[PDB]
Design a protein around this ligand. Structure first.
Ligand SMILES: CCOc1nc(C(=O)NCC(=O)O)c(O)c2ccc(Oc3c(C)cc(C(=O)c4cc(C)cc(C)c4)cc3C)cc12
Lengths: 11, 228
């Protein structure tokens, strides 16, 4: 649930 | 005709750079012409989707205004404009001689490949945009500014900061037109016609979303699925 997006956004 | 202010010159520098930095091989030299709908067509395309989505994510992150929003807002803004931006980015790379779009700065596709590759009528829409964008002679600042307008869209379902986001888009819209004024394109009613292209790009993004409601999901790259 937007886990990969969430990652790419925080990093 | 009002030309860009100094705070606006800096906002143009900010966006142009973030776009140039996230735009593949800014490329005509490093090309690779590719050869009910064959999932073999999917392979070449879904494999190039993730690097393209990522570049959009990277462009977003390099605009301070975007980084100032809550993550759940950033997610919604990136979902809503990713295909719109990948689509503008291919359309400005339409070559009327080959009649091709350049994806990821290297792969040259045709109307037919992209459509039978699974895009359907959205393929005709993107080719038509590219064809009609040839006489516009959009430079890297104009493209980056279109991208910021699509990104900063206040009407996306679920948004929390509708008011802040709208305020940012008004900003880019004014810098964009004052820069358009500064550039004096040899095309009539240039600013109006651009706003019409923005609607063409937003139709592309709404139809792609609708065409992704097709039956398995594990066959589709995972970032593609997270940006519908
Ligand atoms: C051309 C402008 O859009 C694009 N632009 C670029 C690009 O140049 N990006 C520049 C940049 O960001 O630097 C691409 O690399 C693209 C790769 C695949 C693609 O098309 C797709 C295809 C070919 C199939 C699918 C699908 O899996 C699928 C989609 C729908 C709507 C329906 C069904 C059934 C399947 C999804 C997409 C995005 C579209 C791309």
């Amino acid at each position: 649930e937007n886990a990969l997006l969430r990652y790419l956004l925080d990093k | 005709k009002p030309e860009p202010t100094d705070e606006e010159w800096e906002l143009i520098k900010t966006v142009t750079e973030a776009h140039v930095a996230t735009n593949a091989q800014g490329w005509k030299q490093k090309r690779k012409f590719l050869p009910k709908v064959d999932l073999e067509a999917f392979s070449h395309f879904t494999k190039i989707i993730t690097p393209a989505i990522t570049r959009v994510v990277d462009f977003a992150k390099k605009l301070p205004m975007f980084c100032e929003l809550p993550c759940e807002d950033q997610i919604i803004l990136l979902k809503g404009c990713c295909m719109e931006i990948m689509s503008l980015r291919a359309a400005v790379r339409y070559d009327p001689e080959s009649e091709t779009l350049t994806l990821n700065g290297e792969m040259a596709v045709t109307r037919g490949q992209l459509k039978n590759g699974g895009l359907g009528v959205v393929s005709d829409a993107i080719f038509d945009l590219g064809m009609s964008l040839s006489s516009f002679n959009l430079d890297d600042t104009e493209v980056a500014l279109l991208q910021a307008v699509l990104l900063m869209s206040s009407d996306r379902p679920g948004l929390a900061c509708v008011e802040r986001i709208e305020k940012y888009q008004d900003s880019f819209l004014l810098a964009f037109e004052h820069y358009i004024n500064y550039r004096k394109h040899h095309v009539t009613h240039f600013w109006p016609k651009l706003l019409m292209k923005v609607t063409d790009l937003r139709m592309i993004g709404a139809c792609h979303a609708s065409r992704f409601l097709h039956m398995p999901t594990e066959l589709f790259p995972p970032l593609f699925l997270e940006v519908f």
